[PDB]
Design a protein around this ligand. Sequence first.
Ligand code: MG
Ligand code: MG
Ligand code: MG
Ligand code: MG
Ligand code: MG
Ligand code: MG
Ligand code: MG
Ligand code: MG
Ligand code: MG
Ligand code: MG
Ligand code: MG
Ligand code: MG
Ligand code: MG
Lengths: 129, 234, 109, 122, 226, 51
Amino acid sequence: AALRPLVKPKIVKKRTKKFIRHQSDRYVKIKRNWRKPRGIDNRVRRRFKGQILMPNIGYGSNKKTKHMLPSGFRKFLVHNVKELEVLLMCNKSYCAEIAHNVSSKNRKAIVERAAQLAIRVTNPNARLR
Amino acid sequence: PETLKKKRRNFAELKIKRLRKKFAQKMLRKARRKLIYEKAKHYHKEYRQMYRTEIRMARMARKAGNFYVPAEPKLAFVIRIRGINGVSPKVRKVLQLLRLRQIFNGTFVKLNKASINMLRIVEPYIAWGYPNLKSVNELIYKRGYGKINKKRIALTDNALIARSLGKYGIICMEDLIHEIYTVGKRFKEANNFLWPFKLSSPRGGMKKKTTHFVEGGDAGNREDQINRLIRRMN
Amino acid sequence: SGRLWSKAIFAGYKRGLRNQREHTALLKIEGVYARDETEFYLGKRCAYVYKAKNNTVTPGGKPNKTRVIWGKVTRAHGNSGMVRAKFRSNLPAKAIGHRIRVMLYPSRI
Amino acid sequence: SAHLQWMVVRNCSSFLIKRNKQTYSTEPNNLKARNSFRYNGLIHRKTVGVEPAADGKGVVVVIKRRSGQRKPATSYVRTTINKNARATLSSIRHMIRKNKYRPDLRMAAIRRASAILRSQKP
Amino acid sequence: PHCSRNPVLVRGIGRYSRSAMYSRKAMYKRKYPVGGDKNGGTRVVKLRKMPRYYPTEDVPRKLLSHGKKPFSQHVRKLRASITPGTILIILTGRHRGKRVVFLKQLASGLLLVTGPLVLNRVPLRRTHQKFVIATSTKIDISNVKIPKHLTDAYFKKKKLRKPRHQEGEIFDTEKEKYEITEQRKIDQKAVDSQILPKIKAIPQLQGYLRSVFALTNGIYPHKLVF
Amino acid sequence: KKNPLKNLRIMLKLNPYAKTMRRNTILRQARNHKLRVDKAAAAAAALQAKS
RNA sequence: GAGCGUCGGGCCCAUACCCGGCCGUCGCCGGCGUCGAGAGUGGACGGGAGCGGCGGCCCGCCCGCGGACGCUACGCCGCGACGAGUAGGAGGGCCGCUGCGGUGAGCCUUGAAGCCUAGGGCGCGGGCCCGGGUGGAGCCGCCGCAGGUGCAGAUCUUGGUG
RNA sequence: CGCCGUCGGGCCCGGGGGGCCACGCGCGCGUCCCGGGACGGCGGAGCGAGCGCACGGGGUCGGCGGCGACGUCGGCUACCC
Ligand SMILES: [Mg+2]
Ligand SMILES: [Mg+2]
Ligand SMILES: [Mg+2]
Ligand SMILES: [Mg+2]
Ligand SMILES: [Mg+2]
Ligand SMILES: [Mg+2]
Ligand SMILES: [Mg+2]
Ligand SMILES: [Mg+2]
Ligand SMILES: [Mg+2]
Ligand SMILES: [Mg+2]
Ligand SMILES: [Mg+2]
Ligand SMILES: [Mg+2]
Ligand SMILES: [Mg+2]
């Protein structure tokens, strides 16, 4: 409804669960980041059935549509107007995204320029007054 | 200008050269295609002749009350039965030499007394027997994969066999069948041309995979009944 | 006025002794009690109909408590006429022993 | 020695942006935005760039002089075009194709001249 | 002109050999401006002018693949048992199960399966081939006139809405129903007068057609024989 | 790799004689079959003429 | 017979084998011809004689001003077989932390750091970006440089609560 | 010596239906059979335009169609069950 990007097909991702550390649930001193379990007894390194999954490159997503925002574009960060005009040529496949530190004094101006150039901006109504 | 307009009078001569160049390419490959049509006529006359000879020889032997015995057939199709883990050192090396490195892929094997004593050493690991023409007629067509540098390429065309293998006179696919079927003088480089036949698992199921086919099971020699098996694994 | 779909019971997933494969159902289908008798049902649409408190509908106009997972029969299974059925999205496993309607929508007579 | 300038600048330049994605050239003379060899406009002796018009309406086109190098005040010659969106499409085609002046990157000059008017016309 | 000279026996095999088809064709003997003042001449027009705005990123072109042949130019195949003059059964309709008289195969592959309108709700409603079941019981239809006119362009639903965005009533098209029925009232009565004297012949038929179809208790399909 | 021995016109690109190999087989089979029904209509009617 | 024996036809499923999608690794490769004007597995000449045929009277570019995408050379494309891993060794990291020259005419009292978050996503992953809420003054990118630089464990030290 | 062989050698042969990726008479370049036939070459001379259509032919397109609002439509996660 917003700007309708180019050819971007059906998006399969081979897993939508984001691998957890072995025994992340048991504790809160084990943070949910993945770290390779290196025990000499450990079942998950040993890849038993009924345990959790280790990552490997078999889950690597399709190179045609890697790094896909669901609309179709690919994101690109920006802080001001001069860095925003750099998608005047490549706008209908990459989308801008205003950074979290830009003030509403300036966010009104960046999203102003995004209207004229027809560049998708993915936090458009953010930090309004 | 006057010089380039002088070449556009000469361009009608130029496109004659463009005509002539496309032209001989057309009539090479046309009369190279008429060749392939008549070599198969000669084989279809020939395989009828070699097949009906063995009937005709036996029938005038039985008439005069005398046994005909045929020549011990000189080409066996070999398919591997068992696996990889738990392999003797002597049979480790032999199945490498017969291009049977994984399970259920197979080649043709030139039978010979040097090659017979290989197939005793790897008796539990293979199932083998003399094929039929119909079995070889299917394998090169359906599962024809050939290597050129490395990189097994599906055959798909006779230009692949013309360059990679027609050094001896076997430029097309039915010449490849005759040299494979009737073992001639160039069976070695035709058999090296084919990648190993990566078959399927059988349809009906095997029978015990370990004992010899004499014991009712499935391993070993079987002498015509591998035509029965190669319809399953194809 | 009357019933246009045939009745069949859901029996479980296409499983091994230890592992399951949850993405393909199994159907004990009523009336069919032979491998040879199920040359008819190959390719019919199943429909697992169930109840839930919010409202989703179809061209019958008014929003209803009736929700449906679709799917269709692949091939026969075993010798007793038990029949596989690949749905679009898989079963809940609540429905083991409940009913999936076997239609007459796709016809090969 | 244009490739000498490329093998220095192709990384470790200024105004090179590497965030979340591809590099971007962000260079004062360039048509597309890629840090590439062909769309790079400090390096070449013959460069084509189009820009907006600070007058408010029109497209200005930047070309390098080719007469005097290493003289960066006089090394650029510029000219504006304000026409009816079709004659300014052909004039930039005439000035590129009907000279030897970079027959490469024809379309990228035009697509920017395409795009920058539509930002400018409503 | 001439037709193709070569009959077909098996799909893509001509009945005669290559050297004889040479000599069936007798190929041994046939080896062959101003409009004003102050103006300089004829202003040449530009047929098919140049485009103004170039969209800032183009896609490449498809690869043509084969002869996939869009839906207008495919083929029409019908089940053998669904001959003209069959009493079909709808399955999926709003009518869903009524015993509905097949007439003929339309050009689209769909079937124009007339409900005997006096007997059912069903007019000359069109239905699809695979959603219906053949039934062995027959009516003679071969010596029955059909209307010439009726084809796929006649049996389609059409749309019209006056504003583009939303409003207060439902589209003015999906709220008010179809009133082609002024026209179609004649085409149907021209049919059922031509059909019902055939239906009268089988001495239990017009009660059978009034009926509906239901899988009642232990009547499983596949052991029902239609 | 489209499969030979199941479609034609991939047989031909490998084997142009497979046209003539198969077109013989149809005219073998259709002529040999018609000559059986020719005799079968003769032999069953004559044994309808005998019994 | 739901026991033992000799057996037959089915049927069931493993990450194995066939075929297909996808990632990565390895091998063997390809495009500086961006050439809408280049077309070379053979190409120029002026001679002495010739016919197949352009003209026998039997004698020699441009209606169109036009044509997509590519190629960070460490970029991209193509085809093919391959993937287990403790001890261990190498490689790639636009993974993170902290400090230093360089650059971002970067960022911000119109709200920086942190921290929380049934909020929206991206990456196989390390981890990141976005919204909202809190707080109220500094902080981060990219190219290089430098580490006292990445925790679940040591009857870990100190602190704190069950 | 005969005898058996859907034999084979495209044998040849002399008259008297199927079939064949098989088409120069006007007469000449050799061989062959008792003048035709076959050809490696030329003496005959494939007297070209591929102009059209199909396409089991180098990995699917439809130039096919429906049905639903102001509380219902789709959705993914370190939310619960
Ligand atoms: Mg701790
Ligand atoms: Mg261990
Ligand atoms: Mg073992
Ligand atoms: Mg089976
Ligand atoms: Mg077994
Ligand atoms: Mg590994
Ligand atoms: Mg940072
Ligand atoms: Mg950071
Ligand atoms: Mg320090
Ligand atoms: Mg330390
Ligand atoms: Mg540890
Ligand atoms: Mg401790
Ligand atoms: Mg305590």
